[PDB]
Structures are given as structure tokens and as C-alpha cells.
Paper text:
Our data show that this locus orchestrates the degradation of 1,6-β-glucan, and this enables B. thetaiotaomicron to utilize this fungal polysaccharide. The critical enzyme encoded by the PUL is BT3312, an endo-1,6-β-glucanase that is displayed on the bacterial surface, allowing direct access to the intact glycan. The enzyme showed no activity on 1,3-β-glucan, 1,4-β-glucan, or 1,6-β-galactan but was active on the 1,6-β-glucan pustulan, producing a range of oligosaccharides in the initial phases of the degradative process. The crystal structure of the endo-1,6-β-glucanase shows that substrate recognition is mediated by shape complementarity of the substrate-binding cleft and the hooked U-shaped conformation of 1,6-β-glucan, rather than through extensive hydrogen-bonding interactions with the polysaccharide.
The crystal structure revealed that BT3312 comprises two domains. The catalytic domain adopts a (β/α)8 barrel fold (TIM barrel), extending from residues Asp82 to Lys427, and a β-sandwich domain comprising sequences from both the N and C termini. The TIM barrel contains a central eight-stranded β-barrel, and extending from each β-strand is an α-helix. Extended loops link the α-helices with the β-barrel, and a small β-sheet comprising three anti-parallel strands is inserted into the loop connecting β-strand-8 and α-helix-8. The β-sandwich domain contains seven antiparallel β-strands in one sheet, with two contributed by the N-terminal region of the enzyme. Based on analysis of other clan GH-A members, the substrate-binding site of BT3312 is predicted to be positioned on top of the β-barrel. Inspection of this region of the enzyme reveals a deep U-shaped cleft that houses the catalytic residues. The active site cleft of BT3312 adopts a different topology to the substrate-binding regions of other GH-A endo-acting enzymes, which typically display linear or curved clefts that are open at both ends. Interestingly, NMR analysis of Candida glabrata 1,6-β-glucan revealed a hooked, U-shaped conformation, which is complementary to the topology of the substrate-binding region of BT3312 (see below). Thus, the candidate catalytic residues are Glu238 (acid/base) and Glu339 (nucleophile).
Numbering used by the authors: 36 to 62, 65 to 495
Write the structure that this text describes.
Amino acid sequence: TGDVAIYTTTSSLTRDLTRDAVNFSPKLAPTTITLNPAEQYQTMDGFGAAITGSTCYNLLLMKPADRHAFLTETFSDKDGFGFSYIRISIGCSDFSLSEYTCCDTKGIENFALQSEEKDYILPILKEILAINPSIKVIAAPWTCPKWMKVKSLTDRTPLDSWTNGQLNPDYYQDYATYFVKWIQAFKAEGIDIYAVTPQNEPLNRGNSASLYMEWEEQRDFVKTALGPQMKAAGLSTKIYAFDHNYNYDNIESQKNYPGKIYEDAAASQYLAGAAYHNYGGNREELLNIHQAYPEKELLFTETSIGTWNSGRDLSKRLMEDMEEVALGTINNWCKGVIVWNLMLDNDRGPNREGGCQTCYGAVDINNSDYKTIIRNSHYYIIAHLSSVVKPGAVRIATTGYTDNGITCSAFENTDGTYAFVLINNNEKSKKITVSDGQRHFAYDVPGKSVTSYRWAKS
């Protein structure tokens, strides 16, 4: 205990979200980072991970108390790290236990939540809500029902495929109804959907489930059906555009995907902003979009670790992920950060043919005991945000000490606490002083570390 609460993680695991504390120093010093609460940037919604079918199946195979302890650690603000934003699929994802939608039988009248929601998703989200009742939930479809597809806008004949195709414009109003019924069926279970996107990775035709949707199609779906139908149903649910990569998969016509939709006033009126993933391109794109459309929101919604980037090796992952995913997106105006599967087993699953089969969880659980859990970089990068940066916090400017290896972000929470998150990507420890303009503290910041700080303003 003391004036300043600290969480520390080192890439060597000499520290592992280890708790510490210091008190304010009275009365002048070198290597000082100063918070300027007067210069305010975006307001923060939250941070967390995806609650997929696989994640739920793995949680549900644990002993109840063990499951509840893990969810508490993860999601409780007062007794854990306070993960504050989750992402789920509308119908299946590539980490569902099958390919399905909530209207597989032709006709929108047939709409219903399926066994995956009833048996896996809903019971897990209810336990999460019991722990953290204000958690934000964003959702997206991986595919529309198969009968709503055509092969292409050129060839408007049915495509009976979980992957590829485009949305038949004749079904835009019925697909919008699908979203409304889905949001409403979740609300009847006690779950508020905070936001949606129209389609996960709309420029991807592969995966185990997908639907190709160019910006012109998403513009039209939103302005003519999804926007108006959600508003008429009285939904506060926000809509984010895009939900794909920074480089737009190098498809010339689709560059500035969300910006092109914003320039249609009728579509733009329904759009909070844009969601991004980081599987291609450069995060500078976030600053480019923010500068072009500064009244539109940015959200970071998906990234992965796996066999392609030594995802289990924290000595290779922690620094880079905290830089690029966590503080790199937030310092480029993202209002939250959400990684992919919260939990997969040590066999990278369960998973789907055509989907990712080389992915690791934010944590991995051992499928011999459903007890032993190892945290991977994603769990740390999120917990380092969510433990100290609470919903409604405002990101604020910092000035003073920097060098190569030092990255930081500072915030002011609505409760009158400041929060500071600091990467020291240098082999050596650094005695850093942190000042809020009125009081200051100092701390021996370990090498190759992430440290998170929280303290009361005077």
C-alpha cells in the first residue's frame, strides 16, 4: 500500500503483474515525465479480449470455482485486472464449435439464438456480468445466413457457402432485421450490446466463415437498412465501420474504406467510427484517419499471437505487443483495445477447418487438467491497461524524459485518479520521476518491463 499503486511485468517473468507501491516525494529531479491534464485527447471505453465459443468451452470444462477465480482475476475491477470490453460473434466465428448463423433456415421469421449461444456464450457472459456488470460488448458477424448471399454483385445467383460471396442487396432490410432481433434477444438475456460492426474482416473471402463486403456495399447496407432499423427499434448500440486491416489488404478501390463511407452524409450519420485489426499495414493509418475525420471514433478490435510469431515466448512478445497493440493504438487515438480469444487450450483449440489453427490464447489452459493456465503477452498488455485505465478515462499529454525504448500513455479517470502506463524497452533499470503538475513520485523501473501506475489527484 501507499499513495501510488503499481503493477509490473518483465519480459523475463521476474515480475508477473506483480503489485507494488510508492508514496509521493516531497519537493526537483532529473528523468521526469510530466502529465498535462489540460491537454486532453480521446475518452477511453475499455480493453479486453474475445469470448468465443472455444474460450467458453474451455472455461466450462474447468471446475466451477477455478473458472470463477479466473474470471474474477480477469474481469473484476476491485478484485482483479478489470478487463472492460469484450468482443463476440453474431452467429459463428472461426472459434465457434460449428459453422452456423441465427437464421440458417430461409426466411427472417425463423430467427433464433442457437445452441452455441444458449449453452456456451450466454452462461459465460452472465458470469462475467455478475463480476463486472458495466462491461462493454462489441459484436460482429463472420457471415450472413447462406441464403442471403450471391456469388458476386456481377452474378446475382445464390451461393450456398459459409465463406465468400457478397450480401444480396434484396436482403439488406432482412439482414438489418437479423441484427435487431439478435441485439434484442441478447437484451432479453440481460446483456447490453454496446456496439456492432457490419461484418468481421469484410475484405477477407477465406476463413471458416466470411462474407466479402466492399465499402460501397457497407455504405448502402448501413444507410438504407442497418442504421435506420436500429434507430427505429430504439437501440443505443453504436455502429463501427470496416473491422479490418490498416492497409485495406492492398486493394486499391478499398483504400480509405471507412473514410469513403464517412463522406456519404446519409451513411455517416449512423457511424460512430471505424474498427481496425493489425494483421497488415502500419498503425500510422490510425493517425491518418483520425486527422481526416476527427469527430469519428477509432477502436482497436482484433489481433492474434500464434506459431508465426513465437506467441508463447514472452521475451519476444511482451515489449513489441505492448508497443504496437496497446500503447501504439491508444497513442494513435483508439478508444479501446481488444485482442482475440481470451483462452484456448494447449492444442490451440478448439478450432475450425479453414480457420486459424496456429493461434494461441491470451491465456492457454492445459487440456489434461483444465486447471493450469499460462498467461501470454496479450493477457499482460490488456491487464496493464485495464487495471489502471477505467472506462470514461481521458488520455492526456505528457512531456519531458524520453529516449529510445521509452513509450508511455497517461490518463485521468472520472473518479479523480491519474493513470500512467510505461514501457521500458531497455535492458537497464531507470529511476523515473512522474509528476502530475502538483505532486510527484519516483520509481526504479525495471528493464524490459511494463509498469502501470494509479494515484489520486490532490
